[model samples]
Target: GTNSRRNRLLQSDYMNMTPRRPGLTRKPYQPYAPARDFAAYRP
Candidate 1:
């Protein structure tokens, strides 16, 4: 809901987007070499 007033899209992006990745992953957290960019529609 980017269209929402609080903009969950924006808040979630900076707050937990990255953190959630490691949390939900099956492997250990490691730094990406080129730092692959991620963009998606979770809904």
Candidate 2:
């Protein structure tokens, strides 16, 4: 179950790091509703 490893990680170096994303998107809160009760209980 472990045979796709070509030791590529051995040649990797985290010398420099950068932001993963250029910008972040806000939450798309559009008519968000509360989840129903699985126990069939009403609020």
Candidate 3:
């Protein structure tokens, strides 16, 4: 049956880990913004 064939294929293809897991577990890719001054006078 197609159901059994599909199940067997999926079972053989199973892996311990994938690329997606590492990206999520690792730190975020966002960068920090530079500092800004609101004062009207110069340094």
Candidate 4:
């Protein structure tokens, strides 16, 4: 459940852009998506 929690926190943090603590920098995240071919080929 840690991944879910982390994703929730990440979304919240991104939406608010509020630092929960000082001296912390937020980094941009690019989620990975499966290639179109992979999905297209699935039967």
- Please provide, for model 4 over 1-43, each residue's C-alpha lDDT reduced to its tens digit, 9 standing for 90 to 100: 2354444554436546665666565786667786666766778
Clashing residue pair totals per candidate (backbone < 3 A): 0, 0, 0, 0
- In order, what lDDT does every prediction score? 0.57, 0.60, 0.55, 0.58
Candidate 3 lDDT over residue span 1-43, tens digit each: 3354445454435554742334455687667887677576667
Q: lDDT tens digits, residues 1-43, model 1? A: 3564465475456654355546565786777688545655434
Evaluation by TM-score, superior candidate among 1 and 3: 3
Q: Where does candidate 4 clash, by residue pair?
A: none
Candidate 4 lowest-lDDT run of ten: 1-10
TM-score of 4: 0.20
Write down the lDDT that model 2 would get: 0.60
Residue 4 Cα positional deviation in candidate 2, in Å, after optimal superposition: 43
Question: Which candidate comes out best when scored by TM-score?
Answer: 3
Query: Which pairs in model 1 have colliding backbones?
Result: none
